[PDB]
Each structure stands twice: as C-alpha cells, then as structure tokens.
Amino acid sequence: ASKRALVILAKGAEEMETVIPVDVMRRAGIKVTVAGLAGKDPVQCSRDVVICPDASLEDAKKEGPYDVVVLPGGNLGAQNLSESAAVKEILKEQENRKGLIAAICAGPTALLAHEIGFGSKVTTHPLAKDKMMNGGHYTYSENRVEKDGLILTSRGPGTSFEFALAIVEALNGKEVAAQVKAPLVLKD
Amino acid sequence: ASKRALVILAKGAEEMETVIPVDVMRRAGIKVTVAGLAGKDPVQCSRDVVICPDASLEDAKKEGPYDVVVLPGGNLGAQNLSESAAVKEILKEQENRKGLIAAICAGPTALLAHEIGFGSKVTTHPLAKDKMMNGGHYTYSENRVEKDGLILTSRGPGTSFEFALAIVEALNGKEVAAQVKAPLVLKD
C-alpha cells in the first residue's frame, strides 16, 4: 500500500534539489529510490557534494512502476538527463500509464528533449525559459509550482520545499502534506 | 584571500541541513570542507541519503583555522556531535580565537554539551528547546535565525536557506549574500 518514487541522479545535478525532495518524500512515508544515471557509483553534484545512489538506473528500471518520476535540476544534470535514452524510455512509459512526472529548475528541459507532455503549462528557472519554450510546445507559467495534468514543475532551489510538498499532496493527500510540513519550520 | 568553512558530518545528521549550507556557501566562493566525524567513509544521514565527506575530521582538524564551524542538526547527528571529544576541542578553539560557530535545529545542543558560548541568545528547533535550556545557561529566542556574538543559530530544515545566507553575510558581507540569493528563487 506504499507509494513509490524514482529520483534520477546524474552528474551535475543540483544537490539541494535532489536531497530536499528525497528527504521530504521519505518523511511522508514514500519509498524513494535514488537512481544513478550512470550506475551505482557516487555522483558529484553541481556544488561538489557527492551522493551515493541507492541503485543504478538500470536496476531501478526493472523494479517499477513508480507513482512519480522526479528529475532534479542543475544545468549539466539536466543536459545529461536530456541525452539519456534510458530516461526517454522511462518518461515515455510514465506518461503512457498516466503517472506523475515532476521536474524542477532546469529539469523540465529534459521533458522537451524527450517530447514529453506537449501542450501542458510548465515553469522553469527563469534562465531556462528560452530553452524550454523553443518551438512553443508548452505554455509558460511563472508560478513557483505549476501542475498541469500529470506534469508538475517548479522553478529553483528555493522552491524545492514547495515542489516536494506538492508531490506529497499529489500522492498521499493534503493532510499528510500538512503533517509533514509542520516540523520543518517553513515560513508559509 | 579565501574564507574557509568546516561542516562536521556525523551519522544521523539532517541531510537537508547539511547540503543547503554547503551548496550556498560554495556559491558564495567560500572553501567548504565537509568533514566526517568518524572518518573519510560515506555517512548515512537521517533520511538515508548517503553523502561522501571531503575528508575525515582528523585530517580536516590539521588544516585549520576556519572562519566558521558549522554543526548541522538531526537528533542522532547532534548527539554524536555532543559526545565527540574532537568536536569539543574544535569548538573550544574556535571560541577562543573568536571565530564563528553556526548550528541549526538540534545542532545547538552540542554547544551545551561542550560548554560553548554560555550567556548567549540562541534558538533551536522547538522540540529541542527543553534540552538546550537545561540549566538556564542560554537565553532562548524564537527568531528563525539568531546571532549573538560569534554564535549563530537557526531553527529547522525550513530555515536552512536563511541560516546559510546569514553565514555568507557574516563572512563575505551583505552584497555577496544578496547576489548569491537572487538566482535561488527564494520567496523572501
């Protein structure tokens, strides 16, 4: 009866945008797998924090399906996501089964790369807007968190908490999100 | 001409309270060492995120002094900090040289354990208040970030950004803090 989350961790990911959702989602009782794009080996994030993944993406792919697939940001991390064929297959399958797809900051640009969710309202970091909007395949929003259909996006490291709680609320409901939020000492 | 920060990472530390300051401080051009209390080996944080430290605390101790020593929270992480004699020696030396000491959430309780900064105004997570105030050696504040003398404290995972920017401002000044803050997409 346990919801399941896949977080895809590539070299150059924004470490704050990776750790905050993982931690919050685990506080909500979600089973999270931090999967390394390139294998089980430690991943050097954008600000040189080094994180050990729970599994390789190849292994994690075989233990699906997930209720949410999570793409962190970081410019080089998103580019690695955008170039990976395994990511494409994972995302295309999640879209077909109408599962949730969540991406933050530069992460949403991998959706464009993989032709995921065209027609949806999305947000990105302001510095990634032009890249996301090439072709006019999405409609842009400046909301800190944006959810359109099964596509949930958010803007930057400072929106990471609101992004993660929106995932909790989508998966486990508003009461669990409010319960997990109180001990965090968030402002709003 | 580079300021230097020591972050002490023990098993059971709150990973968000560890990664956010490290990342932000590195964005501000500070040289940060993430030092493992028990050695160079990977550290399992409170929500099972596993982080590889930059060095063992023993090695990092020999490459001082630091302009700031940073104690993350997490209940079991703070307890490990509070029990470590190496931490005591590091903190007592930082206090004598009038260097900054920064602790968040449950982290400040290690200060009490090591008899650091008595008489100062401090904050903690609300759930750690009673422990910090045993003996009445400090005055309690409910400000999200509190700074009294060389002692800088903060309340929880959700104050992590404000805590980290206060460190930047203390070390590098208000203009650098404001420059580092803008691309984060913080609310206030």
Short mmCIF file of all heavy atoms in Angstrom, two decimals, chain B residues 115-145:
data_model
loop_
_atom_site.label_atom_id
_atom_site.label_comp_id
_atom_site.label_asym_id
_atom_site.label_seq_id
_atom_site.Cartn_x
_atom_site.Cartn_y
_atom_site.Cartn_z
N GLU B 115 29.91 23.09 26.52
CA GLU B 115 30.04 24.30 27.34
C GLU B 115 30.53 25.47 26.50
O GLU B 115 31.41 26.23 26.89
CB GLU B 115 30.96 24.06 28.55
CG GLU B 115 30.45 22.89 29.43
CD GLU B 115 31.14 22.82 30.80
OE1 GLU B 115 32.32 23.23 30.94
OE2 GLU B 115 30.48 22.36 31.75
N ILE B 116 29.87 25.65 25.37
CA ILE B 116 30.27 26.65 24.40
C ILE B 116 29.28 27.81 24.40
O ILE B 116 28.07 27.61 24.21
CB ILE B 116 30.36 26.04 22.99
CG1 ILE B 116 31.40 24.93 22.95
CG2 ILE B 116 30.65 27.17 22.01
CD1 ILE B 116 32.80 25.44 23.12
N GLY B 117 29.81 29.02 24.55
CA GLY B 117 29.01 30.23 24.39
C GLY B 117 27.98 30.52 25.47
O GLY B 117 26.97 31.23 25.19
N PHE B 118 28.19 30.04 26.70
CA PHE B 118 27.20 30.34 27.76
C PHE B 118 26.95 31.84 27.87
O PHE B 118 27.88 32.64 27.82
CB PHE B 118 27.65 29.78 29.11
CG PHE B 118 27.51 28.29 29.24
CD1 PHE B 118 27.10 27.50 28.14
CD2 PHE B 118 27.76 27.66 30.45
CE1 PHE B 118 27.00 26.07 28.29
CE2 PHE B 118 27.63 26.27 30.58
CZ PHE B 118 27.24 25.49 29.51
N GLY B 119 25.66 32.21 28.08
CA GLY B 119 25.25 33.58 28.19
C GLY B 119 24.66 34.17 26.94
O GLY B 119 24.17 35.27 26.97
N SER B 120 24.76 33.47 25.83
CA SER B 120 24.36 33.94 24.51
C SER B 120 22.89 33.68 24.29
O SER B 120 22.31 32.77 24.93
CB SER B 120 25.14 33.18 23.43
OG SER B 120 26.55 33.40 23.46
N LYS B 121 22.29 34.48 23.39
CA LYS B 121 20.95 34.25 22.89
C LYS B 121 21.05 33.23 21.75
O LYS B 121 21.83 33.41 20.80
CB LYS B 121 20.37 35.56 22.40
CG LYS B 121 18.85 35.46 21.98
CD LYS B 121 18.20 36.83 21.68
CE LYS B 121 18.15 37.75 22.91
NZ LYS B 121 17.36 39.04 22.58
N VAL B 122 20.20 32.19 21.81
CA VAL B 122 20.21 31.12 20.81
C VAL B 122 18.79 30.67 20.48
O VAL B 122 17.87 30.89 21.26
CB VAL B 122 20.94 29.87 21.30
CG1 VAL B 122 22.36 30.23 21.74
CG2 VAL B 122 20.15 29.27 22.41
N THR B 123 18.63 30.02 19.32
CA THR B 123 17.37 29.35 19.02
C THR B 123 17.69 27.92 18.67
O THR B 123 18.85 27.55 18.41
CB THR B 123 16.58 30.03 17.91
OG1 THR B 123 15.22 29.51 17.87
CG2 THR B 123 17.24 29.87 16.58
N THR B 124 16.66 27.10 18.69
CA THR B 124 16.78 25.69 18.34
C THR B 124 15.49 25.29 17.63
O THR B 124 14.54 26.05 17.59
CB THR B 124 16.95 24.80 19.57
OG1 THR B 124 15.72 24.86 20.32
CG2 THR B 124 18.10 25.24 20.41
N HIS B 125 15.42 24.06 17.16
CA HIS B 125 14.10 23.51 16.85
C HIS B 125 13.24 23.56 18.11
O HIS B 125 13.76 23.43 19.21
CB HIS B 125 14.17 22.05 16.36
CG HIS B 125 12.89 21.56 15.71
ND1 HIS B 125 11.84 21.05 16.43
CD2 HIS B 125 12.47 21.60 14.41
CE1 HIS B 125 10.83 20.79 15.61
NE2 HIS B 125 11.19 21.09 14.37
N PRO B 126 11.92 23.82 17.99
CA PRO B 126 11.06 23.86 19.21
C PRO B 126 11.15 22.59 20.03
O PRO B 126 11.08 22.65 21.26
CB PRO B 126 9.65 24.08 18.66
CG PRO B 126 9.82 24.66 17.31
CD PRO B 126 11.20 24.21 16.76
N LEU B 127 11.36 21.44 19.37
CA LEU B 127 11.41 20.17 20.06
C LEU B 127 12.71 19.99 20.81
O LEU B 127 12.78 19.12 21.66
CB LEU B 127 11.24 18.99 19.09
CG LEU B 127 9.83 18.84 18.45
CD1 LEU B 127 9.82 17.67 17.45
CD2 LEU B 127 8.77 18.65 19.49
N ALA B 128 13.70 20.83 20.55
CA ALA B 128 14.96 20.75 21.26
C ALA B 128 15.11 21.84 22.31
O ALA B 128 16.15 21.90 22.98
CB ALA B 128 16.11 20.83 20.23
N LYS B 129 14.10 22.67 22.50
CA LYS B 129 14.24 23.77 23.44
C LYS B 129 14.56 23.28 24.84
O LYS B 129 15.49 23.80 25.48
CB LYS B 129 12.97 24.58 23.42
CG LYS B 129 12.90 25.70 24.50
CD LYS B 129 11.63 26.49 24.29
CE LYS B 129 11.58 27.67 25.21
NZ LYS B 129 10.70 27.47 26.36
N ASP B 130 13.79 22.32 25.35
CA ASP B 130 13.95 21.93 26.75
C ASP B 130 15.35 21.42 26.99
O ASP B 130 15.96 21.67 28.04
CB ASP B 130 12.93 20.87 27.13
CG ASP B 130 11.53 21.46 27.26
OD1 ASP B 130 11.43 22.70 27.42
OD2 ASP B 130 10.55 20.68 27.17
N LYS B 131 15.89 20.70 26.01
CA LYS B 131 17.23 20.15 26.17
C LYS B 131 18.27 21.26 26.18
O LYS B 131 19.19 21.25 27.03
CB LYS B 131 17.50 19.14 25.05
CG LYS B 131 18.92 18.62 25.01
CD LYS B 131 19.01 17.13 25.35
CE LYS B 131 20.46 16.65 25.34
NZ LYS B 131 20.57 15.18 25.16
N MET B 132 18.13 22.24 25.29
CA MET B 132 19.10 23.33 25.21
C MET B 132 19.08 24.20 26.49
O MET B 132 20.11 24.80 26.85
CB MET B 132 18.80 24.18 23.95
CG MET B 132 19.74 25.37 23.68
SD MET B 132 21.22 24.59 23.05
CE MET B 132 22.40 25.92 22.90
N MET B 133 17.94 24.30 27.15
CA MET B 133 17.74 25.24 28.25
C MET B 133 17.97 24.61 29.61
O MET B 133 17.78 25.28 30.63
CB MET B 133 16.31 25.81 28.20
CG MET B 133 16.11 26.80 27.02
SD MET B 133 17.25 28.21 27.13
CE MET B 133 16.63 28.94 28.70
N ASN B 134 18.36 23.34 29.65
CA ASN B 134 18.69 22.72 30.92
C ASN B 134 19.82 23.45 31.60
O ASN B 134 20.95 23.53 31.07
CB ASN B 134 19.05 21.26 30.65
CG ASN B 134 19.25 20.44 31.92
OD1 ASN B 134 19.13 20.94 33.03
ND2 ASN B 134 19.54 19.18 31.74
N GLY B 135 19.51 24.01 32.76
CA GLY B 135 20.46 24.84 33.50
C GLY B 135 20.32 26.34 33.31
O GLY B 135 20.97 27.11 34.05
N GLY B 136 19.58 26.78 32.31
CA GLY B 136 19.43 28.20 32.10
C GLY B 136 20.71 28.89 31.66
O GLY B 136 20.93 30.05 32.00
N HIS B 137 21.60 28.19 30.98
CA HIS B 137 22.88 28.75 30.57
C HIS B 137 22.79 29.66 29.37
O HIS B 137 23.78 30.37 29.08
CB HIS B 137 23.87 27.61 30.30
CG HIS B 137 24.22 26.82 31.53
ND1 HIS B 137 24.92 27.37 32.58
CD2 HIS B 137 24.01 25.53 31.84
CE1 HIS B 137 25.11 26.43 33.49
NE2 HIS B 137 24.54 25.32 33.08
N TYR B 138 21.69 29.60 28.62
CA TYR B 138 21.47 30.48 27.48
C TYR B 138 20.12 31.19 27.63
O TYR B 138 19.27 30.77 28.40
CB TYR B 138 21.44 29.70 26.14
CG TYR B 138 22.64 28.76 25.91
CD1 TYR B 138 22.63 27.47 26.34
CD2 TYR B 138 23.77 29.21 25.25
CE1 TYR B 138 23.67 26.64 26.10
CE2 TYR B 138 24.88 28.37 25.04
CZ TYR B 138 24.81 27.08 25.47
OH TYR B 138 25.84 26.21 25.25
N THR B 139 19.90 32.23 26.83
CA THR B 139 18.59 32.84 26.70
C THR B 139 17.93 32.43 25.37
O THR B 139 18.55 32.47 24.29
CB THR B 139 18.74 34.35 26.79
OG1 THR B 139 19.25 34.64 28.10
CG2 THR B 139 17.42 35.08 26.65
N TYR B 140 16.68 32.02 25.44
CA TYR B 140 16.04 31.42 24.26
C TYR B 140 15.39 32.47 23.38
O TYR B 140 14.76 33.40 23.87
CB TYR B 140 15.02 30.35 24.67
CG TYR B 140 14.65 29.40 23.55
CD1 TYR B 140 15.55 28.40 23.15
CD2 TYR B 140 13.46 29.52 22.86
CE1 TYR B 140 15.26 27.51 22.13
CE2 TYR B 140 13.17 28.66 21.81
CZ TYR B 140 14.06 27.67 21.46
OH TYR B 140 13.76 26.81 20.46
N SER B 141 15.47 32.28 22.08
CA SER B 141 14.83 33.14 21.11
C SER B 141 14.03 32.27 20.17
O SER B 141 14.44 31.14 19.87
CB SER B 141 15.86 33.89 20.30
OG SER B 141 15.24 34.39 19.15
N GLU B 142 12.94 32.84 19.67
CA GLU B 142 12.14 32.15 18.67
C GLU B 142 12.30 32.76 17.28
O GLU B 142 11.52 32.47 16.37
CB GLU B 142 10.65 32.17 19.05
CG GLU B 142 10.34 31.45 20.35
CD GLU B 142 8.92 31.70 20.83
OE1 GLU B 142 8.01 31.93 20.00
OE2 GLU B 142 8.73 31.67 22.04
N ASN B 143 13.32 33.59 17.10
CA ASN B 143 13.62 34.09 15.77
C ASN B 143 14.11 32.93 14.88
O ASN B 143 14.73 31.97 15.33
CB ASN B 143 14.68 35.17 15.84
CG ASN B 143 14.13 36.48 16.35
OD1 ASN B 143 12.95 36.76 16.19
ND2 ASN B 143 14.97 37.27 16.94
N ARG B 144 13.82 33.03 13.61
CA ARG B 144 14.16 31.91 12.70
C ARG B 144 15.67 31.75 12.58
O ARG B 144 16.19 30.62 12.43
CB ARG B 144 13.51 32.18 11.33
CG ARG B 144 12.00 32.24 11.38
CD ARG B 144 11.29 32.54 10.07
NE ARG B 144 11.71 31.70 8.95
CZ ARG B 144 11.24 30.48 8.67
NH1 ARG B 144 10.33 29.88 9.43
NH2 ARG B 144 11.69 29.83 7.59
N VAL B 145 16.37 32.88 12.65
CA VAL B 145 17.82 32.91 12.73
C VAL B 145 18.19 33.85 13.87
O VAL B 145 17.67 34.97 13.95
CB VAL B 145 18.47 33.43 11.43
CG1 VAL B 145 19.97 33.44 11.61
CG2 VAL B 145 18.15 32.58 10.23
#
